[PDB]
Design a protein around this ligand. Sequence first.
Ligand SMILES: C[C@@H](c1cccc2c(-c3ccc(CS(C)(=O)=O)c(F)c3)c(C(=O)O)[nH]c12)N1C(=O)CN(CCCN)C1=O
Ligand SMILES: [Zn+2]
Ligand SMILES: [Zn+2]
Length: 232
Amino acid sequence: SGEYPTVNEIPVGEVRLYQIADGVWSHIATQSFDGAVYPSNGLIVRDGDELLLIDTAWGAKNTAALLAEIEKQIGLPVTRAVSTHFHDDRVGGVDVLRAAGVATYASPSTRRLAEAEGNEIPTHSLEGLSSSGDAVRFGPVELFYPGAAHSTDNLVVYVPSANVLYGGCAVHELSSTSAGNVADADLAEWPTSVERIQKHYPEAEVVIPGHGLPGGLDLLQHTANVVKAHKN
Ligand SMILES: C[C@@H](c1cccc2c(-c3ccc(CS(C)(=O)=O)c(F)c3)c(C(=O)O)[nH]c12)N1C(=O)CN(CCCN)C1=O
Ligand SMILES: [Zn+2]
Ligand SMILES: [Zn+2]
């Protein structure tokens, strides 16, 4: 009924949308992994009379549900999708998208890592993102590669019309107590990568983590803080 929806409020398989700003929504879904249930976020950005999708809903059935929810709540076609790193909460559902007419994109790094992991693989490569600090435009967003953090390939997304920073899994929510799933992380580089985000997007008004509640710019410093203590 208006609050950001939380892990225990979303059955696995259902998707909710949350209006962030004019023409910007997050999508929230839940999934099981190793016997525990987790929420995860993605983004939807209006692109004229079409939509740009950032990240899948963590699985094929969740991603089908996402498309249905978009049709119900927004009613514009999803034409392109970007996955912000190679893990299943970002690419699981790409095959659903591709069969629903969506053109799927990721960096070449993400595509290689996805392929090697046995995850679904976006069709199109995003060049121009291979060095930290790189940025490219993609419809109504800027894509930015901050350096290695939660993964070596993680991208962040900025919506300049709304000053919305989608951090993906490089950014954690304020309630977080550790750095989440660090299996593929670079804990030592992560603070430097977060500092690059802070320097590049100082006017961000909303910051959306890969998992959990949006907030403001404090999510960046909080992330640095939890990562440094996890490394230690
Ligand atoms: C799909 C993804 C994954 C699986 C399960 C959980 C997560 C998490 C995760 C965990 C805890 C918290 C709470 S907290 C910040 O307070 O700790 C959180 F907010 C996110 C995050 C996240 O942190 O992004 N991701 C998760 N995932 C990986 O990330 C690595 N991996 C193994 C495969 C190796 N290639 C895998 O399955
Ligand atoms: Zn991940
Ligand atoms: Zn994640």
